[PDB]
Amino acid sequence: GAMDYSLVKALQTAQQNFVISDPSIPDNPIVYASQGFLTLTGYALSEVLGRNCRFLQGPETDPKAVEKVRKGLERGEDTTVVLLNYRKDGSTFWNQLFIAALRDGEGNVVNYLGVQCKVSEDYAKAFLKNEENEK
Ligand SMILES: Cc1cc2c(cc1C)N(C[C@H](O)[C@H](O)[C@H](O)COP(=O)(O)O)C1=NC(=O)NC(=O)[C@@H]1C2
Ligand SMILES: [Cl-]
Ligand SMILES: [Mg+2]
Numbered sequence: 122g123a124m125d126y127s128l129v130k131a132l133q134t135a136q137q138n139f140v141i142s143d144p145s146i147p148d149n150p151i152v153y154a155s156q157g158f159l160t161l162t163g164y165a166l167s168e169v170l171g172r173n174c175r176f177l178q179g180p181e182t183d184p185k186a187v188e189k190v191r192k193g194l195e196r197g198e199d200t201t202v203v204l205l206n207y208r209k210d211g212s213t214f215w216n217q218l219f220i221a222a223l224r225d226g227e228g229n230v231v232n233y234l235g236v237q238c239k240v241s242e243d244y245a246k247a248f249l250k251n252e253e254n255e256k
Contacts, residue, residue, distance in 0.1 A: 123153035163209035177206040215245035
Protein backbone atom coordinates (compact mmCIF):
# COMPACT_ATOMS: atom_id res chain seq x y z
CA GLY A 122 0.00 0.00 0.00
CA ALA A 123 0.87 3.68 -0.18
CA MET A 124 2.55 3.83 3.18
CA ASP A 125 4.75 0.81 2.47
CA TYR A 126 7.17 2.83 0.32
CA SER A 127 10.28 3.85 2.32
CA LEU A 128 10.32 7.32 0.75
CA VAL A 129 6.70 7.83 1.75
CA LYS A 130 7.56 6.91 5.30
CA ALA A 131 10.46 9.37 5.15
CA LEU A 132 8.20 12.18 3.90
CA GLN A 133 5.69 11.43 6.69
CA THR A 134 8.34 11.70 9.42
CA ALA A 135 8.89 15.32 8.29
CA GLN A 136 5.13 16.04 7.85
CA GLN A 137 5.41 16.84 4.15
CA ASN A 138 2.43 17.43 1.91
CA PHE A 139 2.34 14.62 -0.70
CA VAL A 140 0.10 12.46 -2.83
CA ILE A 141 0.42 9.10 -4.50
CA SER A 142 -1.35 8.36 -7.78
CA ASP A 143 -2.10 5.06 -9.51
CA PRO A 144 -1.53 5.25 -13.26
CA SER A 145 -2.81 1.69 -13.77
CA ILE A 146 -6.30 3.11 -13.22
CA PRO A 147 -7.68 5.27 -16.05
CA ASP A 148 -6.76 8.91 -15.62
CA ASN A 149 -4.20 8.30 -12.86
CA PRO A 150 -6.24 9.21 -9.78
CA ILE A 151 -4.91 10.05 -6.36
CA VAL A 152 -4.91 6.93 -4.11
CA TYR A 153 -3.33 8.53 -1.02
CA ALA A 154 -2.88 12.07 0.30
CA SER A 155 -1.09 13.13 3.42
CA GLN A 156 -2.70 15.09 6.21
CA GLY A 157 -0.83 18.23 5.26
CA PHE A 158 -2.17 18.04 1.70
CA LEU A 159 -5.72 17.69 3.08
CA THR A 160 -5.32 20.63 5.45
CA LEU A 161 -3.68 22.78 2.69
CA THR A 162 -6.46 22.06 0.21
CA GLY A 163 -9.53 21.75 2.39
CA TYR A 164 -10.70 18.29 1.24
CA ALA A 165 -11.22 15.11 3.23
CA LEU A 166 -9.14 12.06 2.33
CA SER A 167 -12.11 10.13 1.01
CA GLU A 168 -13.03 12.97 -1.34
CA VAL A 169 -9.53 13.26 -2.76
CA LEU A 170 -9.09 9.55 -3.36
CA GLY A 171 -10.30 8.78 -6.86
CA ARG A 172 -9.70 12.27 -8.32
CA ASN A 173 -6.88 13.30 -10.63
CA CYS A 174 -4.96 16.00 -8.86
CA ARG A 175 -5.78 18.45 -11.65
CA PHE A 176 -8.88 19.16 -9.54
CA LEU A 177 -6.69 21.71 -7.75
CA GLN A 178 -6.34 23.78 -10.92
CA GLY A 179 -8.59 26.58 -12.10
CA PRO A 180 -8.88 29.48 -14.49
CA GLU A 181 -5.87 31.46 -13.27
CA THR A 182 -3.60 28.40 -13.35
CA ASP A 183 -1.07 28.77 -16.16
CA PRO A 184 -1.77 26.03 -18.75
CA LYS A 185 1.94 26.15 -19.70
CA ALA A 186 2.88 24.90 -16.23
CA VAL A 187 0.30 22.17 -16.52
CA GLU A 188 1.63 21.18 -19.99
CA LYS A 189 5.17 20.91 -18.49
CA VAL A 190 3.83 18.42 -15.95
CA ARG A 191 1.92 16.49 -18.60
CA LYS A 192 4.97 16.20 -20.85
CA GLY A 193 7.22 15.15 -17.96
CA LEU A 194 4.87 12.38 -17.00
CA GLU A 195 4.68 11.35 -20.69
CA ARG A 196 8.48 11.51 -21.24
CA GLY A 197 9.37 9.61 -18.04
CA GLU A 198 10.98 12.62 -16.45
CA ASP A 199 11.05 13.97 -12.93
CA THR A 200 9.36 17.36 -12.92
CA THR A 201 9.33 20.39 -10.68
CA VAL A 202 6.94 23.34 -11.26
CA VAL A 203 5.26 26.18 -9.45
CA LEU A 204 1.59 26.82 -10.26
CA LEU A 205 -1.54 28.38 -8.87
CA ASN A 206 -3.93 26.00 -7.18
CA TYR A 207 -7.35 26.30 -5.58
CA ARG A 208 -8.70 25.03 -2.27
CA LYS A 209 -12.19 23.60 -1.85
CA ASP A 210 -13.46 27.09 -0.94
CA GLY A 211 -12.07 28.62 -4.16
CA SER A 212 -9.22 30.49 -2.42
CA THR A 213 -5.88 30.30 -4.21
CA PHE A 214 -2.29 29.50 -3.28
CA TRP A 215 1.05 28.97 -5.07
CA ASN A 216 2.06 25.32 -5.10
CA GLN A 217 5.59 24.05 -5.78
CA LEU A 218 5.22 20.48 -7.03
CA PHE A 219 7.92 17.80 -7.16
CA ILE A 220 6.76 14.72 -9.10
CA ALA A 221 8.50 11.42 -9.75
CA ALA A 222 7.69 7.97 -11.01
CA LEU A 223 7.93 5.01 -8.63
CA ARG A 224 9.14 2.03 -10.64
CA ASP A 225 9.41 -1.70 -10.28
CA GLY A 226 12.43 -3.87 -10.97
CA GLU A 227 11.65 -3.89 -14.62
CA GLY A 228 11.10 -0.11 -15.09
CA ASN A 229 7.31 -0.19 -15.04
CA VAL A 230 5.74 2.85 -13.42
CA VAL A 231 3.71 1.47 -10.53
CA ASN A 232 2.77 4.75 -8.88
CA TYR A 233 3.59 8.47 -9.02
CA LEU A 234 4.70 10.41 -5.94
CA GLY A 235 4.13 14.16 -5.80
CA VAL A 236 5.34 16.42 -3.01
CA GLN A 237 3.62 19.86 -2.62
CA CYS A 238 5.05 22.96 -0.88
CA LYS A 239 2.86 26.07 -0.48
CA VAL A 240 5.12 28.97 -1.40
CA SER A 241 4.76 32.72 -1.08
CA GLU A 242 3.82 35.01 -3.99
CA ASP A 243 7.31 36.51 -3.76
CA TYR A 244 8.91 33.05 -4.02
CA ALA A 245 6.62 32.00 -6.87
CA LYS A 246 7.49 35.15 -8.81
CA ALA A 247 11.22 34.64 -8.37
CA PHE A 248 11.01 30.90 -9.22
CA LEU A 249 8.98 31.55 -12.34
CA LYS A 250 11.25 34.46 -13.44
CA ASN A 251 14.26 32.10 -13.03
CA GLU A 252 12.54 29.28 -14.92
CA GLU A 253 11.70 31.73 -17.70
CA ASN A 254 15.22 33.22 -17.88
CA GLU A 255 16.70 29.71 -17.90
CA LYS A 256 14.44 28.50 -20.77
C1 LIG B 1 1.58 12.23 -8.15
C2 LIG B 1 0.99 13.51 -8.69
C3 LIG B 1 0.90 14.64 -7.88
C4 LIG B 1 0.34 15.82 -8.38
C5 LIG B 1 -0.15 15.79 -9.77
C6 LIG B 1 -0.05 14.69 -10.59
C7 LIG B 1 0.51 13.52 -10.08
C8 LIG B 1 0.60 12.31 -10.95
N1 LIG B 1 -0.68 16.96 -10.30
C9 LIG B 1 -0.57 17.17 -11.71
C10 LIG B 1 -1.92 16.80 -12.28
O1 LIG B 1 -2.43 15.67 -11.56
C11 LIG B 1 -1.66 16.49 -13.73
O2 LIG B 1 -0.54 15.59 -13.84
C12 LIG B 1 -1.33 17.77 -14.49
O3 LIG B 1 -2.46 18.65 -14.42
C13 LIG B 1 -0.97 17.47 -15.94
O4 LIG B 1 -1.97 16.67 -16.58
P1 LIG B 1 -3.17 17.29 -17.45
O5 LIG B 1 -4.19 17.93 -16.54
O6 LIG B 1 -3.72 16.13 -18.25
O7 LIG B 1 -2.51 18.31 -18.37
C14 LIG B 1 -1.09 17.99 -9.51
N2 LIG B 1 -1.54 19.09 -10.15
C15 LIG B 1 -1.88 20.16 -9.43
O8 LIG B 1 -2.30 21.17 -10.07
N3 LIG B 1 -1.81 20.18 -8.10
C16 LIG B 1 -1.34 19.15 -7.37
O9 LIG B 1 -1.32 19.21 -6.13
C17 LIG B 1 -1.04 17.84 -8.02
C18 LIG B 1 0.23 17.09 -7.55
CL1 LIG C 1 -1.96 12.61 -14.61
MG1 LIG D 1 -13.28 9.15 -3.30
